[PDB]
């Protein structure tokens, strides 16, 4: 690595690996929760 090098320039990398296990969830997107409703038909999203 020298700044004059493009395929020979330094690149920083971050790889995000996501676990979609059957377990309780742990890291969420910013989507805001709302109150539960029962016996009425609903569109739903639990943990994604």
């Amino acid at each position: 690595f020298q700044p004059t090098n493009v395929g020979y320039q330094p690149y920083r990398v971050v790889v995000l690996s996501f676990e979609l296990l059957h377990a309780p969830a742990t890291v969420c997107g910013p989507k805001k929760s709302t109150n539960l409703v029962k016996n009425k038909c609903v569109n739903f999203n639990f943990n994604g």
């Binding site: 296990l21 059957h22 377990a23 309780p24």
Partner: peptide, 24 residues
């Protein structure tokens, strides 16, 4: 020394509820 395990030492393979079923 040794002993027969019989049919002990089964465990839940994943955190999913399943009931009244023969699941592979």
């Amino acid at each position: 020394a040794y002993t027969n395990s019989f049919t002990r030492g089964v465990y839940y393979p994943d955190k999913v509820f399943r009931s009244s079923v023969l699941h592979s």
